[PDB]
């Protein structure tokens, strides 16, 4: 059920639409989740979804978290990943399921959460995660693999392409609209997000940039710049900058690393 | 020195247009002024517009110096920092507007993102300036501009940057050069405003007269706006900083003639000049040599300094003719003058035979024909 909480166009819409001071919205989630699952995993028999969400919130309340990606990721990490031999590794029986999920979400956040709440013995981020099996590892060592079919996204994994977009947002725009006229991607966009359009495409992209900037500010724990107070409605983050009181405040801040858009 | 001082006070009692200019070394005096300032105002290293990439805006170069200075004072010891790079980002984003040769319509929506409305690079730059003053705890910023003697055509960009960007209460322009040079550029790009078809058809006396009269009016109206005459400095001359004929001597100079000159043997400037003129010309100490050295005291300071740091030095060489020693120096010093005169440039052709024809030709351009053989400094031509 978890996957719906992290991958849902309707959830995105509702969250972005409602103000930042709203609170007491968990209904919007439970409703939106039943929707998103209805669209994606239609086959569920109308009660399993209810029970799964109920048990999820059950776990959340029992463990005393707030409904949110913190709790969700903690659940996902404890359920999938362990710390094993070298770096965290994944359960063999649950591997296929992990892939089913990766079909929907990105590992990196889950990975960071596992490091936070269950670091291994005192790591460098490495994707993708793996299970372990000594015999297979010995085979791979003795013979190594041989890549023969890699042409999906150029030859790269997408999660880097998202960072690449944030690095060159305008460029991903250009690519989008040039093709948005092509019928095929119009259908694809409608099928994925009906009200997608390049306009909200730009909006969401620049918003995500804003969010990463602000959340990085707080991650460095820096004296929480005043303009957050003015920042009240997510759509306010649809602009390159924000107006606090007569002044227009951007979001860029200093990050330790040079490759500001690095996966690391 | 003293003019530098009064100039310093003039700037200081200015922040309580905003451009001061220096008529014209000149760079030496400007550096003097700047370091004199090192009533808090933060100044920038002087800009040499003649030593910048052929295409770039003085605004960009100033922004770069601002960046360096801010990073320096900021790396000394936030929140000023981050909002600063914000202004940086807006400025970088809206900057195309200047360089761009075509108006891409896609810039229209960029013209549609937000107190006057638009992407006024002037307002971005002025908010930048406020940021810089606030961060540096300075009343304002001194901005310095070097002579464009070697490239007089770049100064247009500086003038335009002043008009469109430096109409601020927190920036102080300080430029150097000769106003006639800027006058040409104003002349040229006023003319470049008409229509070529107009220019090549409506070309009778009356129309040309009216056009030029308007263009000169615009010269005068615009240069006054750019360079407040009260904001004008005269750049005292070396002869006026010396006795005209001994009844003066504002700030005596004194110069060293040989290597030693233990700050006591420094043999004046005027007296050594007259001495060299007399000996290398065999002139006596009458009235004709004094007038000549007076008409040597009005030549360029670099010219005079070289003319009297090449003559005596090679004299020291020879001592371990005086006229040949000095005539060699004049050869290079007025060398451009002499060749432009169409006179003997070939060194091994000096003699008496070439010299007679040269004198005849010199008088032939000097008109005269009565006392030209005096070869005295009496001509209007400064060459």
Contact call for B82 and A252, based on CB within 8 A: yes
Contact call for B81 and A254, based on CB within 8 A: yes
Query: Two tokens at A167?
Result: 């690095």
> In chain A, which residues are last before a break of more than 2.5 Å from C to the next N?
122
The count of other CB atoms within 10 Å of the CB of residue B188 is: 12
Per the CB < 8 A criterion, the answer to whether B292 and B377 are in contact is yes
Residues of A in contact with B90 (CB under 8 A): 241, 248, 250
Per the CB < 8 A criterion, the answer to whether A159 and A108 are in contact is yes
Query: Is the link from the previous residue into A128 a cis peptide, with omega within 30 of 0?
Result: yes
Query: Two tokens at B180?
Result: 């006639």
3-state secondary structure chain A: CHHHHHCCHHHHHHHHHCCCCCCCCHHHHHHHHHHHHHHHCCCCCCCHHHHHHHHHHHHHHHHCCCCCHHHHHHHHHHHHEEECCCCEEECCCCHHHHHHHHCCCCHHHHHHHHHHHCCCCCCCCCCCCCECCHHHHHHHHHHCCCCCCCCCCCCCCHHHHHHHHHHCHHHHHHHHHHHHCCHHHHHHHHHHCCCCHHHHHHHHHHHHHHHHHHHHHHHCCCCCCCHHHHCCCHHHHHCCCEECCCCEECCCCCCCCCCCCCCC
Phi/psi of residue B68, nearest 5 degrees = -60, -50
Query: Is the CB of residue B71 less than 8 Å away from at least one CB of chain A?
Result: no
**Structure determination technique employed:** cryo-EM
In terms of Cα–Cα distance, which of A105, A115, A218, A209 is closest to A163?
A209
- The C-alpha angle with vertex B37 and arms to B32 and B42, in degrees rounded to 5, equals 130
- Torsion, CA A103, CA A106, CA A112, CA A113, rounded to 10: -60
**Chain B interface, best mutation among A202, A220, A252, by max B CB count within 10 A:** A252
Query: Two tokens at B295?
Result: 């008409």
Q: At CB < 8 Å, which residues of chain A contact B?
A: 223, 225, 239-241, 243, 246, 248-250, 252-254
- Residue labelled with tokens 């009496």: B378
Instruction: State the resolution, in angstroms.
Output: 6.7
Contact call for B113 and A250, based on CB within 8 A: no
Torsion sign, CA atoms A48, A54, A56, A58: negative
What residues of chain B, 73 to 112, have a C-beta less than 8 Å from chain A?
A: 79, 81-83, 85-86, 89-90, 93
Contact call for B114 and A243, based on CB within 8 A: yes
Nearest CA in chain A to B78: A222
- Residue labelled with tokens 């694809």: A188
The count of other CB atoms within 10 Å of the CB of residue A260 is: 15
Query: Two tokens at B200?
Result: 């090549």
Provide the b/e sequence for B96-124 (b: ≥16 CB within 10 Å): eeeeeeeeeeeeeeeeeeeeeeebbbbbb
Nearest CA in chain B to A243: B114
Contact call for A250 and B114, based on CB within 8 A: no
In terms of Cα–Cα distance, which of A169, A150, A141 is closest to A261?
A169
Residues of A in contact with B83 (CB under 8 A): 249-250
Phi/psi of residue B232, nearest 5 degrees = -105, 140
Query: Two tokens at B88?
Result: 């940086």
The count of other CB atoms within 10 Å of the CB of residue B361 is: 14
Query: Two tokens at A89?
Result: 């590794």
Nearest CA in chain A to B87: A250
Contact call for B89 and A243, based on CB within 8 A: no
Q: How many CB pairs under 8 A join A and B?
A: 27
Residues 6+ apart with CB under 8 A from A196: A189, A190
Per the CB < 8 A criterion, the answer to whether B170 and B126 are in contact is yes
Per the CB < 8 A criterion, the answer to whether B308 and B255 are in contact is yes
Phi/psi of residue B208, nearest 5 degrees = -60, -40
Contact call for A240 and B79, based on CB within 8 A: no
Per the CB < 8 A criterion, the answer to whether B149 and B181 are in contact is yes
Angle of helix A9-17 versus helix A26-40 axis, rounded to 10: 150
Q: How far is CA B78 from the centre of its chain?
A: 41
3-state secondary structure chain B: CHHHHHHHHHHHCCCCCCEEEEECCHHHHHHHHHHHHCCCCEECCCECHHHCCCCCCHHHHHHHHHHHHHHHHHHCCCCHHHHHHHHHHHHHHHCHHHHCCCCCCCHHHHCCCCCCCCCCHHHHHHHHHHHHHHHHCCCCEEEEECCCCCCCCCHHHHHHHHHHHCCCCCEEEEEEECHHHHHHHHHHHHHCCCCHHHHHHCCCHHHHHHHHHHHHHHHHHHHHHHCCHHHEECCCCCCCCCCCCCCCCCCCCCCCCCCCCCCCCCCCCHHHHHHHHHHHHCCCCCCHHHHHHHCCCCCCHHHHHHHHHHHHHHHHHHHCCHHHHHHHHHHHHCHHHHHHCCCCCCHHHCCCHHHHHHHHHHHHHHCCCCCHHHCCCCCCCCC
Name the CA radius of gyration of chain A, rounded. Answer: 21
Calpha distance A76→A118 (Å, rounded): 12
Option in A240, A249, A254 nearest B113 (CB): A240
> How far does B83 lie from chain A, in Å, by closest CA?
7
> How far does A54 lie from chain B, in Å, by closest CA?
45
Query: Two tokens at B302?
Result: 């670099």
């Amino acid at each position: 059920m978890e996957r719906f909480l992290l991958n849902s166009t309707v959830l995105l819409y509702r969250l972005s639409t409602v103000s930042l001071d709203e609170v007491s919205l968990d209904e919007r989630v439970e409703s939106s989740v039943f929707l998103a699952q209805y669209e994606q995993a239609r086959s569920l028999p109308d009660h399993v979804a209810k029970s799964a969400w109920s048990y999820l919130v059950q776990q959340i309340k029992q463990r005393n978290m707030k409904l949110g990606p913190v709790a969700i990721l903690r659940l996902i990490a404890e359920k999938f990943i362990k710390n094993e031999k070298g770096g965290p590794k994944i359960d063999l029986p649950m591997f296929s399921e992990w892939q089913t999920l990766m079909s929907r979400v990105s590992c990196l956040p889950i990975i960071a959460c596992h490091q936070v709440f269950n670091p291994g013995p005192a790591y460098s981020f490495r994707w993708p995660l793996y299970p372990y099996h000594p015999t297979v590892e010995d085979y791979i060592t003795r013979e190594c693999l041989h890549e023969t079919h890699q042409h999906l996204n150029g030859s790269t994994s997408a999660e880097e392409c998202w960072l690449d977009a944030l690095k060159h947002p305008e460029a991903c725009l250009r690519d989008f609209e040039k093709g948005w006229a092509s019928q095929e991607m119009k259908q694809l966009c409608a099928q994925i997000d009906p009200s997608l359009t390049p306009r909200i495409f730009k909006d969401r992209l620049q918003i995500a940039c804003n969010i990463r900037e602000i959340l990085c500010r707080v991650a460095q724990g820096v004296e929480l710049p005043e303009w957050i107070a003015s920042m009240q409605n997510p759509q306010q983050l649809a602009n390159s900058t924000i107006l606090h009181n007569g002044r227009e405040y951007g979001f860029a801040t200093v990050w330790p690393i040079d490759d500001k858009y690095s996966q690391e | 020195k003293s003019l530098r001082d009064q100039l310093v006070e003039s700037i200081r009692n200015s922040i309580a247009r905003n451009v001061f200019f220096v008529d014209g070394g000149k760079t030496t005096f400007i550096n003097s002024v700047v370091k004199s300032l090192n009533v808090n105002i933060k100044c920038l290293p002087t800009i040499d517009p003649t030593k910048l990439p052929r295409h770039e805006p003085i605004l960009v170069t100033v922004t770069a110096r601002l960046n360096k200075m801010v990073s320096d004072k900021l790396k000394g010891y936030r929140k000023q920092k981050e909002q600063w790079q914000n202004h940086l980002a807006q400025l970088q984003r809206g900057l195309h507007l200047l360089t761009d040769k075509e108006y891409k319509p896609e810039y229209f929506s960029d013209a549609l993102k937000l107190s006057i409305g638009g992407q006024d690079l002037s307002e971005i730059f002025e908010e930048l300036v406020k940021r810089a003053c606030e961060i540096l705890d300075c009343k304002a910023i001194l901005i310095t501009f070097d002579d464009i003697d070697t490239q007089f055509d770049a100064g247009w960009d500086v003038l335009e940057s002043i008009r469109k960007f430096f109409n601020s209460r927190k920036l102080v322009v300080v430029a150097t050069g000769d106003l006639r040079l800027y006058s040409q550029l104003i002349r040229g790009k006023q003319y470049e405003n008409y229509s070529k078809t107009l220019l090549e058809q409506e070309k009778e006396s009356v129309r040309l007269a009216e056009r030029g009269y308007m263009v000169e009016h615009l010269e005068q109206q615009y240069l006054l706006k750019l360079f407040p005459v009260q904001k004008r400095i005269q750049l005292k001359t070396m002869l006026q900083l010396v006795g005209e004929k001994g009844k003066a001597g504002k700030e005596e100079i004194k110069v060293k003639t040989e290597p030693s000159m233990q700050d006591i043997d420094a043999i004046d400037v005027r007296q050594a000049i007259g001495d060299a003129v007399r000996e290398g010309l065999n002139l006596r100490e009458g009235s004709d040599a004094d007038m000549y050295v007076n008409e040597l005291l009005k030549q360029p300071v670099r010219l005079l300094m070289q003319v009297l740091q090449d003559f005596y030095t090679k004299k020291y060489h020879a001592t371990s003719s005086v006229p040949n020693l000095l005539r060699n120096a004049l050869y290079g010093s007025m060398l451009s003058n002499i060749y432009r005169a169409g006179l003997n440039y070939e060194q091994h052709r000096f003699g008496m035979d070439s010299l007679c024809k040269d004198i005849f030709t010199y008088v032939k351009q000097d008109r005269d024909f009565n006392t030209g053989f005096y070869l005295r400094p009496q001509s209007e031509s400064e060459a």
